[PDB]
Amino acid sequence: GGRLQFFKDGKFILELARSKDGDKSGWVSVTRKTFRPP
Amino acid sequence: EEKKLTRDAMEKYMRERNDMVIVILHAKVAQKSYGNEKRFFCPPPCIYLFGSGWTRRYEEMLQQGEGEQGAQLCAFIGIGSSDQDMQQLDLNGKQYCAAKTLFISDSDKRKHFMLSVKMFYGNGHDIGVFNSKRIKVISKPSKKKQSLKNADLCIASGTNVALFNRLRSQTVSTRYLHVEGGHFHASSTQWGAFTIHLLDDNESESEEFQVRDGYIHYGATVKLVCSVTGMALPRLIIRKVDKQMALLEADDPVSQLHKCAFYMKDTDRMYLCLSQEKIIQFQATPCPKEPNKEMINDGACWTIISTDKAEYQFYEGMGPVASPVTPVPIVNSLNLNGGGDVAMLELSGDNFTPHLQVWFGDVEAETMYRCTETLLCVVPEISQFRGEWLWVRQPTQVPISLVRNDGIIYATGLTFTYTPEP
Amino acid sequence: KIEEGKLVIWINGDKGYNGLAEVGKKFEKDTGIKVTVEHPDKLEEKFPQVAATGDGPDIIFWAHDRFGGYAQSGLLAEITPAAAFQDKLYPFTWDAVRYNGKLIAYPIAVEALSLIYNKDLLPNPPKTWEEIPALDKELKAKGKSALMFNLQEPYFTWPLIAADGGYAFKYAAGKYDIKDVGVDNAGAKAGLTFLVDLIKNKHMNADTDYSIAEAAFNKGETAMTINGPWAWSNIDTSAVNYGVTVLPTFKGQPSKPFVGVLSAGINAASPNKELAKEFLENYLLTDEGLEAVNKDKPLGAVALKSYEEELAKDPRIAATMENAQKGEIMPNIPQMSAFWYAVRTAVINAASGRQTVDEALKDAQTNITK
Ligand SMILES: OC[C@H]1O[C@H](O[C@H]2[C@H](O)[C@@H](O)[C@@H](O[C@H]3[C@H](O)[C@@H](O)[C@@H](O[C@H]4[C@H](O)[C@@H](O)[C@@H](O)O[C@@H]4CO)O[C@@H]3CO)O[C@@H]2CO)[C@H](O)[C@@H](O)[C@@H]1O
């Protein structure tokens, strides 16, 4: 899958990844270095 | 004849990127003029022009038969109230111009204001009105410990400052810390904006130095770095100045328009000092009466002030337009907007109108106007960039533009990459 | 943005677009509706970029592999032909344009690559890829080469890569498994190694593209080429006496071309959907409409049963279908372009020496599934 990374004056500000199987795509925000306990 | 931007016109723009750039460098605070005495803004607000587009437009107008006077750039600067009493800037054919006679009288009761730069050609063709960032009106700094009276009066690590020295009974009144040709100077015509970095007390001398946050206090080890060249001075100790003496005991926060001295860390009482346009080290004499006080030269007393910058970029994608290019839309942040059936990209900023479209490179996106501070867009098809994976050396930083119905392209400082999921 | 009361069509530059424009002129004479046929470069990438903002053509032509990606983004109008019209085309061609249970385009023609050879330079073309180095040495001594074909597009090199075991997506449990890619297995590596060895030994050049290979074959400088039915017209007008035959085998196994079905989709943003349907069903998909296109650039084995039967005796079409039977009809799933982009770079990087065969394919394997 591909990932979108946005930069404001060369500084990383946002990352988007594609939405899962259900149902269409679609973009979701992502924090790859953050674990959220359930 | 108002014309929409074509993909061909965007492709042409993306080849050279010759955006018209206007920079306004200024102080974040301004001291008031009580009575009749005018206290001119110091350092003087500076207007910079960048890009080959300015000279190109001038030559196009001369070949169109506008004449020298018609082709000339006209620039005026004001305080915004009273609106009528703007001052001319001699900006024509120049890289920059400083506004040396700006003031705010005691009759003006505004707590804050912005500088306004009005630009047009001699033939009457309007460019627009470009604002500085918000400037706070302040009273003269007092001899009191700054107990965080305003986060605005304090100076945070990682923020920019100007440093100047006022000369008494001299033909040159004021000198500013400035970098040129890899050297620090005490210039009479130019001033630099220096990033002031807070360092740990045990941090050694080096160029690739540490990261520390918080407000700058007296007695702190600081690094002054040129925001344009990256040139730095060696480690300094920012110290409070009283009369003509440095106060070692001072631990209070550094405030706007405070007179301060910079002790060269790990030297024998050497202080950052001017001698004409030169920057030197000058040795302080210890006070015989007071133990924690050192007598410094007049050239070693620097006034500190926080600075800011306003930057505007525009491009006539479909050639000259009948309407001003201002207010220039500004994008401060991006977020994904969940509220609604389809997850849209949200652009937060200022000066948005229903006449703006978001473009991802040369691809126009479906744009929804919400209010003057918010635009939403559907991320367009960008999977063609998978054609570049393992072909380009580094992922392409694709520019995001705001395009007006008349073809004006506004560069936003925003870029995106499209890369494989890790 | 798309203009109502007119039709704009996009079709690739290698297809019979002048023949299609003749069908458009007949449509205009009978209906008063002007038909504009365009062949923009990268039309298959531009279509999802412009159709998402209400722009683009009313009708888009491309092989069926691109269409599932367009349908997933809501860019195509659903195709609902009457039973009597649907029965006029081969069921397997409708299967190529069926996505998530819906017909998303009209099938036009079936295409497959074949080996094309110059009968005067080479009366007995090689049955195997393995005998091409010795043949090239023999032809080089007379100032000729054995084989020239497009090395820039993975469509042309895929039959060899697939021969010993390479595959795009594994089909399992009623669907294509987008996580099971077959571009870095032993079979794919053997096929690409053989191709890179041909370049290393100077039997082929890494820079050979479509126009270079076509000019060389059509001028009689190379004994063989690899191409599809669309290329036959330009050979007909040359002085070359050519044959169209089975692709060479590799490691005793047939070359497996990915079979394309040229298809016509209707833009979901079009205000002329009924005019587009009338043009496609009543004008194009007729013996007369397909003949006008086929006379310009051969279509291959057309989807229309009556016209396919008429042309079936052409030995060049019989060779196309012999090669097609040895390969498989491409998936139409959205990930197909991801597979093609990754394989394109792997072949170019391995052919140029930028990556080894193993590293190029291992990286393509990851990216095709990413
Ligand atoms: O920068 C990378 C290149 O990107 C673009 O090319 C991509 C296409 O967008 C993808 O769709 C794919 O192309 C496939 C094509 O979808 C598939 O049908 C087949 O194409 C055959 C076609 O069926 C046949 O009728 C005839 O026209 O020959 C075509 C092949 O030349 O195979 C294609 C892949 O080889 O992948 C390609 C990249 O490989 C863009 O158009 C390029 O300009 C760009 O360089």
Residue numbers in the entry:
A (entry chain B): 232 to 269
B (entry chain F): 101 to 522
C (entry chain A): 1 to 370
Paper text:
Transcription of Notch target genes is regulated by the transcription factor CSL (for CBF1/RBP-J in mammals, Su(H) in Drosophila, and Lag-1 in Caenorhabditis elegans). CSL functions as both a transcriptional activator and repressor by forming complexes with coactivator and corepressor proteins, respectively. In this case, Su(H) binds the antagonist Hairless, which in turn interacts with the corepressors Groucho and CtBP (C-terminal binding protein) to repress transcription.
To determine the Su(H)-Hairless-DNA crystal structure, we purified recombinant Su(H) (98–523) and Hairless (232–269) proteins from bacteria and stoichiometrically formed a complex with a 15-mer duplex DNA, containing a single Su(H) binding site. However, the region between β-strands e and f undergoes the largest structural change upon Hairless binding, resulting in a completely new conformation of this loop, as well as displacement of the terminal β-strand by as much as 4.5 Å. Previously, we showed that the region of Hairless that binds Su(H) is a random coil in solution; however, Hairless assumes an extended β-hairpin conformation when bound to the CTD of Su(H). Clearly, the binding sites for Hairless and NICD partially overlap, and the conformational changes induced in CTD by Hairless binding would sterically block interactions with ANK and MAM.
